Design a protein around this ligand. Structure first.
Ligand SMILES: Cc1cc2c(nc3c(=O)[nH]c(=O)nc-3n2C[C@H](O)[C@H](O)[C@H](O)COP(=O)(O)OP(=O)(O)OC[C@H]2O[C@@H](n3cnc4c(N)ncnc43)[C@H](O)[C@@H]2O)c(O)c1C
Ligand SMILES: O=C1N[C@H](CO)[C@@H](O[C@@H]2O[C@H](CO)[C@@H](O)[C@H](O)[C@H]2O)[C@H](O)[C@H]1O
Ligand SMILES: *[C@@H]1O[C@H](CO)[C@@H](O)[C@H](O)[C@H]1NC(C)=O
Ligand SMILES: *[C@@H]1O[C@H](CO)[C@@H](O)[C@H](O)[C@H]1NC(C)=O
Ligand SMILES: *[C@@H]1O[C@H](CO)[C@@H](O)[C@H](O)[C@H]1NC(C)=O
Length: 541
């Protein structure tokens, strides 16, 4: 059975592409290597307390932190060394869900977008019609567990910040703070799974298959003939063809897509040779003379981040989220079960803030804070009251110059070959300035104490002793960046892979630089735009 589009990976990129292309009347197959996530996808991983609702760990926002503390987390991709979601929805089924509409600079030709992409408004608007921002996700309109917001707002107001409803004016971020915004609906996780996927699934020309892994595309030189999967019931020895004018879209995530390309003889020679080292994978490669040399996995960017941990007597650390699955506070559980209001209708973040920093190298960089009750890690030589802890996670985003590298190892695992954090010295300088500014007026808030790093350790000492791996912000972008030439990019303005007739990419890898805030809003706007460019590209099905 041939398809006009075969879309690999049911993450945000893939699902949006699948919806839009299927909406246009094209015969579309979406493939996903993992299984069900939320209730409506057939998921059954439900907390004891939540049983009657059928709402799973992925459905309930307040269960977010428990995605990291489960004894048996089947949702993480098992062959990637850093967090990636491998289930229906990808990262959007397991993420914090912080949702910021992209601003103009996020789509600027100055950060590497082609000119033809800079007018993101029509696409961003269109995104907002499917996934409206909310900073009060509880179905009663009220906000809950806000003590950390209240504390840090006072800190920030002393630093000259102003509060805003963040998504009302995306272009205005400097010295702004506000309640955390999410793409939730009816007090539950929503995202593309609850929207774009549902309108797709209603169409006779859309087919969705889960538990199917794509190893590689099959190609005759520049012409992609289809995909190779591990499911022999879908075609000869698992091969699924495209129609004659058909196209393959890769949306398997920064590590997923890069791996599929390497396994298809597309990417840096060192990576393809790594594939060739596995005799089985070697047999599926094109001959070496047809290998396409592109910077796949190069230019990898992720936010540097540093966690700062504090106590304040007004804080409610919510048992450090340790009990939300097996033994939640009865009133909170009851309230959520009844109508999906209360604590459980939001994830852990409560406050977000941003600040612009001039760069000695000419690049203006943005710092971002994400404030939540509780803390993953505490290193204090002094006693502290664990019921009073909260975290300020400080990131750099817009403007940073650091780049790393992702790829595969000899076992064909997606891995960080070169850590992308603080490669550029001016990025580190600005990060330390950003940290110093956050805590500059800590003494002006009575009872506010920084417990990691404690009083014995300076911010400079802390950053230098910090495990780089722990700086991972799960915001991988640019590993198959959009651009103008195969000398520095992997896809062109129509998100087509250089050197191919009909291979495309719609996932975070195409984004040329981190956006100002957490990236899923930027990605989803980009996916809308990508789908339009693909439909408008002549010679398609
Ligand atoms: C991992 C993670 C990510 C977070 C998180 N938090 C936020 C947040 O709060 N807000 C935000 O903006 N971004 C957040 N991010 C980032 C955001 O979720 C990601 O940037 C975003 O989901 C990336 O979308 P992509 O389309 O590039 O890729 P995904 O990994 O989401 O999806 C790929 C999918 O394809 C699949 N797939 C992969 N390889 C495949 C193969 N070979 N065959 C078939 N399917 C495959 C997957 O199983 C998966 O479903 C976070 O808490 C975690 C733990
Ligand atoms: O965009 C994001 N948003 C979410 C929400 O801010 C972050 O969640 C954090 O993710 C960390 C893991 O990366 C956890 O250890 C930590 O407890 C958790 O709060 C996540 O790291 C980040 O990628
Ligand atoms: C590759 O495709 C070209 C052009 O369609 C064709 O001439 C050739 O026979 C194909 N090669 C193989 C091995 O099928
Ligand atoms: C810990 O902090 C909480 C909230 O401030 C307070 O209720 C509790 O009594 C504190 N415990 C101790 C040891 O004082
Ligand atoms: C943990 O804190 C101690 C002081 O309490 C400090 O000397 C040590 O370096 C810290 N560890 C790290 C890795 O930052």
């Amino acid at each position: 059975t041939p398809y006009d589009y075969i879309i690999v990976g049911a993450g945000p990129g893939g699902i949006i592409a699948a919806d839009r292309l299927s909406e246009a009347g094209k015969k579309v197959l979406l493939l996903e290597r993992g299984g069900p996530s939320t209730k409506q996808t057939g998921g059954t991983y439900v907390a004891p307390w939540a049983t009657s609702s059928g709402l799973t760990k992925f459905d309930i926002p307040g269960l977010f932190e428990s995605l990291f503390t489960d004894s048996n987390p089947f949702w993480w991709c098992k062959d990637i060394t850093v967090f990636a979601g491998c289930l229906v929805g990808g990262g959007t089924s397991v993420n914090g869900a912080l949702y910021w509409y992209p601003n103009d600079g996020d789509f600027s030709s100055s950060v590497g977008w082609p000119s033809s992409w800079t007018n993101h408004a029509p696409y961003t608007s269109k995104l907002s019609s499917r996934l409206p921002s909310t900073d009060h996700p509880s179905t009663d309109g009220q906000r809950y567990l806000e003590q950390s917001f209240n504390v840090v707002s006072q800190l920030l107001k002393g630093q000259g910040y102003n509060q805003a409803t963040i998504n009302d004016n995306p272009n205005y971020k400097d010295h702004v703070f506000g309640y955390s915004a999410f793409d939730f609906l009816n007090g539950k996780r929503a995202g593309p799974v609850a929207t774009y996927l549902q309108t797709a699934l209603a169409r006779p020309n859309f087919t969705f298959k889960t538990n199917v892994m794509v190893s590689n595309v099959v190609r005759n030189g520049s012409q992609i003939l289809g995909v190779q999967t591990n499911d022999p019931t879908l075609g000869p020895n698992g091969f699924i063809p495209v129609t004659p004018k058909g196209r393959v879209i890769l949306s398997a995530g920064a590590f997923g897509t890069s791996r599929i390309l390497f396994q298809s003889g597309i990417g840096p020679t060192d990576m393809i040779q790594t594939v060739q080292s596995n005799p089985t994978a070697a047999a599926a490669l094109p001959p070496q003379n047809q290998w396409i040399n592109l910077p796949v996995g190069m230019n990898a960017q992720d936010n540097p981040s540093i966690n700062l941990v504090f106590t304040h007597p007004s804080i409610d650390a919510y048992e450090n989220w340790a009990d939300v699955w097996s033994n939640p506070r009865p009133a909170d559980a009851a309230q959520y079960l009844a109508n999906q209001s209360g604590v459980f209708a939001g994830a852990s973040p409560k406050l977000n803030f941003w600040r612009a920093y001039s760069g000695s190298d000419g690049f203006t960089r943005y710092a971002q804070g994400t404030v939540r009750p509780g803390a993953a890690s505490v290193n204090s030589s002094l006693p502290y009251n664990a019921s009073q802890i909260f975290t300020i996670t400080v990131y750099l985003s817009t403007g940073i110059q650091s780049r790393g590298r992702i790829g595969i190892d000899a076992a064909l695992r997606g891995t960080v070959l070169t850590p992308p954090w603080l490669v550029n010295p001016v990025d580190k300088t600005v990060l330390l300035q950003a940290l110093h500014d956050v805590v500059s007026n800590i003494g002006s808030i009575p009872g506010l104490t920084m417990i990691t790093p404690d009083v014995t350790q300076t911010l400079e000492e802390y950053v230098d002793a910090y495990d780089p791996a722990t700086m991972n912000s799960n915001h991988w972008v640019s590993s198959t960046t959009i651009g103008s030439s195969p000398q520095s990019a992997v896809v062109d303005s129509n998100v087509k892979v250089f050197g191919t007739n009909n291979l495309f990419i719609v996932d975070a890898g195409i984004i040329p630089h981190l956006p100002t805030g957490n990236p899923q809003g930027t990605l989803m706007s980009a996916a809308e735009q990508a789908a339009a460019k693909i439909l408008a590209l002549a010679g398609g099905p």
